[PDB]
Amino acid sequence: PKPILYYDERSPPVRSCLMLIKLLDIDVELRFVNLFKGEQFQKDFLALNPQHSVPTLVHGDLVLTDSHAILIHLAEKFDEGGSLWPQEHAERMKVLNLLLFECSFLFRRDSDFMSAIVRQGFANVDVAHHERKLTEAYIIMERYLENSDFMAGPQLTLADLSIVTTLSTVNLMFPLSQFPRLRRWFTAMQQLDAYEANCSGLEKLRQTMESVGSFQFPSSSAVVT
Amino acid sequence: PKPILYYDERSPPVRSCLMLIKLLDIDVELRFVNLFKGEQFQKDFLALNPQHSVPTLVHGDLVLTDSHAILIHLAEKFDEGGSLWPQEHAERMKVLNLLLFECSFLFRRDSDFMSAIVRQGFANVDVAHHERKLTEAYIIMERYLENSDFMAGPQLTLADLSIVTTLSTVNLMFPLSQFPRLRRWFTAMQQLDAYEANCSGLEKLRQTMESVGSFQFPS
Numbered sequence: 189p190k191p192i193l194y195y196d197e198r199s200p201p202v203r204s205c206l207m208l209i210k211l212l213d214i215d216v217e218l219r220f221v222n223l224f225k226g227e228q229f230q231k232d233f234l235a236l237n238p239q240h241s242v243p244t245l246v247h248g249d250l251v252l253t254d255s256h257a258i259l260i261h262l263a264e265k266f267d268e269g270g271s272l273w274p275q276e277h278a279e280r281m282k283v284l285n286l287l288l289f290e291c292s293f294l295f296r297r298d299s300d301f302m303s304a305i306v307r308q309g310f311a312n313v314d315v316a317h318h319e320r321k322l323t324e325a326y327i328i329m330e331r332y333l334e335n336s337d338f339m340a341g342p343q344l345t346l347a348d349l350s351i352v353t354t355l356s357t358v359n360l361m362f363p364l365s366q367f368p369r370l371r372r373w374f375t376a377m378q379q380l381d382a383y384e385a386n387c388s389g390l391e392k393l394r395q396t397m398e399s400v401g402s403f404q405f406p407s408s409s410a411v412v413t
Numbered sequence: 414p415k416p417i418l419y420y421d422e423r424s425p426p427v428r429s430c431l432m433l434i435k436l437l438d439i440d441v442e443l444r445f446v447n448l449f450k451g452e453q454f455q456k457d458f459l460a461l462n463p464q465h466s467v468p469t470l471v472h473g474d475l476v477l478t479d480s481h482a483i484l485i486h487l488a489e490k491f492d493e494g495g496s497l498w499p500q501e502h503a504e505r506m507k508v509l510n511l512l513l514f515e516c517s518f519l520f521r522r523d524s525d526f527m528s529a530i531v532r533q534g535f536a537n538v539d540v541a542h543h544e545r546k547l548t549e550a551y552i553i554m555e556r557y558l559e560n561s562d563f564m565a566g567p568q569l570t571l572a573d574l575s576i577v578t579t580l581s582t583v584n585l586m587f588p589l590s591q592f593p594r595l596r597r598w599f600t601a602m603q604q605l606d607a608y609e610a611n612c613s614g615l616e617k618l619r620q621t622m623e624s625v626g627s628f629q630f631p632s
């Protein structure tokens with residue numbers, strides 16, 4: 189049976205999977221789970237994924253509950269032998285390493301900030317604290333791109349798909365003026381046809397956050413091309 | 414080209430690597446980085462790993478900066494044909510899925526709690542809040558164990574190595590009395606020869622935390 193993706197496109201790791209699905213032309217059934225309405229706590233979804241998170245993939249009997257496993261699984265099954273999840277061991281470990289940076293560092297910090305806004309309202313968030321935490325992530329990505337054209341080496345990999353969605357989300361709030369390699373790379377990602385899959389959920393996330401958090405992102409921060 | 418592991422055994426993900434190294438008899442050069450003195454911010458280590466994190470593995474030209482990548486790399490290089498990192502795709506994805514649960518959920522929540530102690534001091538941490546978050550992780554793992562002896566299936570895998578160290582660290586503070594499957598799994602893990610590599614750093618973490626957090630674990 190074809191893969192089933194439980195999704196809310198406002199989430200950047202969901203959008204990373206949508207980008208890969210578009211890039212490889214994978215036929216997938218989409219099932220919406222509204223994270224802001226709490227539909228991830230519905231009894232049936234909880235039984236399927238006790239972490240109450242999207243993206244969740246059901247592909248036959250395999251149930252994957254983390255975007256990075258979903259990206260690797262889909263690459264192995266639909267980009268067999270390809271370069272998104274490279275064949276050579278060291279290149280593949282480099283991609284894996286950056287997927288884990290996205291999980292453990294970039295997304296961890298973006299989620300900390302966004303959840304603070306939802307729970308507290310923007311006016312009651314220590315924005316400076318989160319600006320420091322997220323600028324630190326910018327600095328690290330800039331260091332990676334000083335030595336490499338894409339995040340994990342000379343060509344597009346799963347690492348770029350995973351990182352660009354969260355980066356575009358962080359950059360709704362924090363400008364990239366001081367980060368020329370990151371700007372160049374983000375601009376290049378924005379030219380990819382697959383990036384069209386990031387645009388709609390990024391904008392829906394912007395709308396939802398401004399309403400739920402009672403604020404406006406600074407329009408000047410987002411890199412637009 | 415022998416691997417170099419930058420480490421501080423108080424960190425649970427470091428201990429997961431130490432356990433794999435012992436399990437697989439891997440010859441590694443250890444380099445101590447003292448996280449509680451901020452040696453992870455020294456210019457040369459920061460140039461090597463801008464995330465200023467341990468474990469960091471240098472294996473020739475490859476620089477790995479996340480325990481889960483290190484576990485997979487070492488299994489692939491030193492345990493081809495083993496059950497720790499299964500060859501069969503669905504089995505391997507299942508292990509990978511639980512490794513990411515450890516990274517994204519169990520360790521995130523344990524790090525949030527421990528970070529809040531070191532920063533705010535134990536007396537000022539909202540312990541009930543962290544107890545709710547970390548007990549939720551216990552509940553999930555109890556369900557993962559419903560129809561398997563180990564986290565990812567019938568056999569020991571990298572997922573068990575990654576989870577046991579953080580679990581043993583959470584369990585300094587929160588008991589497993591209420592989780593029969595988790596308590597039995599944890600007790601089985603402690604009977605493995607490789608589990609000896611977890612003991613020293615867990616006790617050093619307790620000592621360091623109780624001193625820096627000015628409290629004592631109920632353990």
Ligand SMILES: C[C@]12CC[C@@H]3c4ccc(O)cc4CC[C@H]3[C@@H]1CC[C@@H]2O
Pocket residue numbers: 198199200223224298299300302303306354357393
């Ligand atoms: C705020 C939540 C946690 C953080 C989530 C997040 C975190 C980061 C991000 O870039 C987008 C989102 C959208 C959904 C958010 C969730 C909606 C309910 C849940 O509380």
Ligand SMILES: C[C@]12CC[C@@H]3c4ccc(O)cc4CC[C@H]3[C@@H]1CC[C@@H]2O
Pocket residue numbers: 423424425448449523524527528531579582583618
């Ligand atoms: C407290 C730090 C973050 C949380 C870290 C942690 C987080 C979880 C855990 O089980 C152990 C440790 C040991 C080192 C800790 C670090 C030493 C300084 C840093 O701030």
